[PDB]
Design an enzyme around this catalytic site. Sequence first.
Site, mmCIF file in Angstrom:
data_model
loop_
_atom_site.group_PDB
_atom_site.id
_atom_site.type_symbol
_atom_site.label_atom_id
_atom_site.label_comp_id
_atom_site.label_asym_id
_atom_site.label_seq_id
_atom_site.Cartn_x
_atom_site.Cartn_y
_atom_site.Cartn_z
ATOM 1 N N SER A 183 30.950 -44.162 91.286
ATOM 2 C CA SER A 183 30.443 -44.530 92.615
ATOM 3 C C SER A 183 28.919 -44.594 92.535
ATOM 4 O O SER A 183 28.386 -45.231 91.610
ATOM 5 C CB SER A 183 31.013 -43.563 93.645
ATOM 6 N N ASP A 195 36.936 -48.076 94.065
ATOM 7 C CA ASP A 195 36.089 -46.961 93.664
ATOM 8 C C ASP A 195 36.711 -46.183 92.514
ATOM 9 O O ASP A 195 37.931 -46.021 92.435
ATOM 10 C CB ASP A 195 35.855 -46.029 94.852
#
Lengths: 342, 342
Positions: free
Chosen positions: B51, B185
């Site tokens: 991330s 993600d």
Amino acid sequence: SEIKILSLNGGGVRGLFTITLLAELESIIEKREKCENVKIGDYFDLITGTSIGGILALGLASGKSARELKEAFEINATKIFPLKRFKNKQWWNLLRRSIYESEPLYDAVKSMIGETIKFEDLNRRVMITSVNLSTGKPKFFKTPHNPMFTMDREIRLIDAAMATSAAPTYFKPHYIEKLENYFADGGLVANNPSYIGIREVLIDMKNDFPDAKPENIKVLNIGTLSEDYCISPETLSKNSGKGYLSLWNMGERIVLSTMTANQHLQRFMLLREFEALKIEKNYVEIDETIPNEAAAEITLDNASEGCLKALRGSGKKLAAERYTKNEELRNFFLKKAEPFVP
Amino acid sequence: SEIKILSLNGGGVRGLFTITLLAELESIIEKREKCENVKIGDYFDLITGTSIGGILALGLASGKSARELKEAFEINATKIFPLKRFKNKQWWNLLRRSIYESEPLYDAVKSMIGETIKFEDLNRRVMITSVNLSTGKPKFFKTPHNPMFTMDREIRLIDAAMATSAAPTYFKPHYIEKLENYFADGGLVANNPSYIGIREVLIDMKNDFPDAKPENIKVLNIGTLSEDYCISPETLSKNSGKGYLSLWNMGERIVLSTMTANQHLQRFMLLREFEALKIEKNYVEIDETIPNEAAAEITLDNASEGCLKALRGSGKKLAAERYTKNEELRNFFLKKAEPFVP
């Protein structure tokens, strides 16, 4: 010595596929190997499980044959996943409440194992994987086979079974009144609990197995015919932008893609470790894509007659064929395991 | 030898704490060791990330100092998570489109690392974790430091950075035109990439380190002050069984709980392994907590002035204390890691 783990992934009625394959294997041993009252759970030193795989793991550890569990699953599958709520997902219902109810699943689990059985009255070691949504940490409901970790001793098996099967969107978080905590599905961290089961055997169950190495661990990861889940490219291309509710379909796709991703990652880690020690043969997995099913219609919940028939046929055929050719699936059931004394 | 891994967790805005800690560490290195033009990424043989941690890892691997990244993050913390979208979530907005837009994040990542740089132009190894929602399998964007795995050679760094930061319900899935696949993600599989980073060093980074052991691996896992995340007990006691839209806040809580549980599980596995091999000192973590905020109040996308100031102050203070007392942190920046050549 040889240590055997029985890993059961979670997929819902794909758990019925798992239990059908296990029951067919049980019958195959009963017929070919000339045995009586054979239980598929007596040949393993640890029975890991997640979601409905975890429920089946608790059923096998409690001392029940895979055939009784398969009968209970067949009776209760339509009750666990009614078509009334399956066909009325929509979004105005998913915003106010979760799909289905915990009570039918609770009664199904009560029929399978019971209500007054606790982890301290179990003769076989078992894991239940779950996520504790009150401390933020995962919770692994295991039997007191490690003196340093003897909690869950006064915890009913049904509590852990409902904790692991509480899919974040498909159910509601399970409240354990003993710990004043809530729990979610174990697939949020480990949908394939083979890796964590191996870790537990290596570092936790050391009193039972002081000399434990990876080369002397055999894992029987019974899949759920859902390993190759994915989001179809059409709904991605039509919803990767704003998303007309088809991307992250009320959280169902979030949860499903998450569980598939963790299952793939843990399987990848296990396979890489076994190739590192050149013990790739020690991992036995039974999971094949349905020829008539594209890898997007895999649903956690489908109690329709067609899906149940497909799961049953796949389980029976896979059990028979893999016992015929795969030597290790036969090798898993040569000797019974020794019950553990807490 | 001494293999050093710099793993950075994913927290969204809370990566401001990570970049502030790294920039402050750079400043203290310059002040104390009397060095000139210090890049904090020059002391590690591998820089994993996830991330915003993955974005920072790509920035450090591209050759940027932590202070340039800190300035870029100072502007783009406001420019990425606008107050308008953070204050306008509600229920009818998140129903139609993902919160925020990918274009501000794309512009930020372009400003820091660039747009025309690919994985083959990098001089330091780097893994970025992401979930491929086209095959359902996790995808680890890595440099061609292993001859057997190269298919990321012709992939731009910006594509990987945008793929790893596409938090579900927070950003639309990233489309890579070269692969014709969509990604999400990396916190769904590994919010703390330290464990998979060590696995990569042992099993993949063997061309550069043929003799690799867990003993000679040092991990500097900088958190994001979000380890102790959990659902508020009041919210659960109100609508856990009821399942109102507050529980599973349109996937926000599903994804956040999944990240927290994955991070806890991976850190638990890493710590258990290091205790088993008695190398607990190797893992260094500078993930503290904010002592003036509820655990349930940890948000992934809060870029208000108060939260930014708290993250900055925590980073500065933690850098100062941990350089003063933690000798392993000092041992990290003693000898620069040699750049890798494909």
